[PDB]
Amino acid sequence: PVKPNYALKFTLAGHTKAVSSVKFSPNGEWLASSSADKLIKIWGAYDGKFEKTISGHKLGISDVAWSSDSNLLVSASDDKTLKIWDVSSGKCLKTLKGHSNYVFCCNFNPQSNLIVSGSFDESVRIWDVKTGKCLKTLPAHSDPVSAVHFNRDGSLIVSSSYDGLCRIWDTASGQCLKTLIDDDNPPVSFVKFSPNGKYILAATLDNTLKLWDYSKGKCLKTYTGHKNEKYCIFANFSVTGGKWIVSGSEDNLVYIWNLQTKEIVQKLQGHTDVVISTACHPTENIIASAALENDKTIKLWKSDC
Ligand SMILES: CCCSc1nnc(C)c(O)n1
Ligand SMILES: CCCSc1nnc(C)c(O)n1
């Protein structure tokens, strides 16, 4: 297809403060959301039906992530901890203590025996899921860490920071393998590996998304047209149908680009505040979007391609 046709299917209301992150479970059945209201909520991925609320953090939550078997969640909070949750029982299995300030981002590795986290304290930490202990503390950046993500086989971690850098780390050794810098270094607000593992996608607070060949250290694609000068907005690869780049925006729209041509192919209208988070369903052409304090809702969109 040349262009997708995402249309609003469901609006999910429940959070009483800004939503911070939405993520689809790997098995495609659920959507998890985190919020400044200190809560995690679980929703049906296909019907938007509210399932349950998971509570325990003492301050707002910035991020949530699923284990590969869709049974566990990890959350990152302003209370300087991460928590590991058994979704079915709602129980907090482990509280990960070590960061000295706000935890902003988190992710399981594919094996899901490890968690990576990034914090306002400018460090990246690697945790053992089963013991809950910190295995490594990486002196990753000189400003708050905005995102952390494992590659397809968990051998690498990419981190981004307001210091303008993206860095690639060897999971096993903790060594910094790459530092990525273009002709300028505006604050990097988000980063993640592509599904095929060949690229990273980085958002900078100069209204720009960039596709990098991280190995060769070269910028391949640039995506613009949206607004992003303040917030750490999640961006995504959509690969279930047409090959798109998906991101939120500070003009309250969801932006969708053709990955190859860099052309904007759709702008999704509906939210009434900054779209801070987007997520792409693992098998269906479905997008979840979430907005900040003046909106508080999550929206589910579906396309035929
Ligand atoms: C009873 C059907 C619930 S709705 C639904 N829609 N799409 C998919 C892929 C799915 O598994 N269920
Ligand atoms: C698992 C492969 C899904 S297909 C795919 N298509 N395009 C890109 C950029 C990508 O990373 N994966």
Task: Please give the resolution of this entry in Å, rounded to 1 decimal.
Answer: 1.6
**DSSP annotation string for 147-201:** EEEE-TTSSEEEEEETTS-EEEEETTT--EEEEE--S--PPEEEEEE-TTSS-EE
State which approach was used to obtain the coordinates. Answer: X-ray
Q: State the Cα–Cα distance between residues 27 and 282, nearest whole angstrom.
A: 8
Q: State the Cα–Cα distance between residues 70 and 87, nearest whole angstrom.
A: 8
Going from the Cα of 256 to the center of ligand 1, the distance in angstroms, rounded, reads: 24
- Strand bridging mode 30-35 / 19-24: antiparallel
Q: Is 10 in the pocket of ligand 1 (CB under 6 A)?
A: no
Q: Considering only CA atoms, which of 257, 232, 261, 246 is closest in space to residue 299? A: 246
Residue type, 254: V
H helix or E strand, kind and range, residue 86: strand 81-86
Going from the Cα of 10 to the center of ligand 1, the distance in angstroms, rounded, reads: 14
Q: State the Cα–Cα distance between residues 44 and 29, nearest whole angstrom.
A: 6
Nearest ligand, CA 238? 2
| Cβ pair 48, 300 in contact under 8 A | yes
Q: State the Cα–Cα distance between residues 207 and 215, nearest whole angstrom.
A: 24
Q: Considering only CA atoms, which of 187, 162, 184, 166 is closest in space to residue 176? A: 166
Q: Is 46 in the pocket of ligand 1 (CB under 6 A)?
A: yes
Q: State the Cα–Cα distance between residues 42 and 34, nearest whole angstrom.
A: 9
Q: State the Cα–Cα distance between residues 212 and 228, nearest whole angstrom.
A: 19
Q: How far is the CA of 203 from the CAs of 45, 89, 272, in angstroms?
A: 26, 36, 22
Instruction: Give residue limits of the domains in the chain.
Output: 1-305
Q: State the Cα–Cα distance between residues 199 and 149, nearest whole angstrom.
A: 12
DSSP 52: E
| Cβ pair 128, 112 in contact under 8 A | no
Q: Which residues contact 183 (CB under 8 A, 6 or more apart)?
A: none
Residue type, 47: D
Block residue for tokens 């907090």: 92
DSSP 139: -
Residue type, 145: V
Tokens representing 159? 């981190």
Q: State the Cα–Cα distance between residues 160 and 93, nearest whole angstrom.
A: 28
Report the Cα 14 to chain-centroid distance in Å.
21
Which residue blocks in 29-147 are alpha helix, DSSP H?
Answer: none
- b/e burial code for range 142-172 (CB count within 10 A of at least 16 → b): eebbbbbbbbeebebbbbbbbbbbbbbbebe
Nearest ligand, CA 194? 2
**1-305 has which fold?**
Methylamine Dehydrogenase; Chain H (2.130.10)
